[PDB]
């Protein structure tokens, strides 16, 4: 309108909080391949 534009400017405000979880680690899984594949069985450990 002439040289001027209509703008909504804030007249009041507050502070808002926002949470953000970022994963940086995970459970350190470890496998005993021999115990998993063959358990206690000697005949399996031989073939493995």
């Amino acid at each position: 309108v002439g040289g001027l534009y209509e703008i909504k400017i804030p007249t009041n405000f507050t502070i808002v909080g926002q949470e953000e979880f970022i994963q940086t680690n995970s459970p350190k899984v470890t496998i005993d391949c021999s115990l998993f594949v063959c358990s206690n069985y000697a005949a399996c450990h031989d073939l493995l």
Binding site: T30, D32, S34, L35, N40
Partner: protein
């Protein structure tokens, strides 16, 4: 991380139903009235 061990069994548990009769399987197999393949006979042995 060394290979997985298992605790050694310290005793043996053996269970069987006592005082069951003999199955007599030989008496039935040695019976001289032998059937042909056409009329092959069956016997079922349990609790013996």
């Amino acid at each position: 991380d060394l290979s997985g061990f298992t605790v050694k069994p310290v005793a043996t548990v053996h269970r069987r139903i006592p005082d069951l009769p003999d199955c007599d399987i030989d008496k039935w197999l040695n019976n001289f009235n032998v059937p042909s393949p056409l009329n092959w006979e069956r016997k079922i042995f349990s609790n013996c």
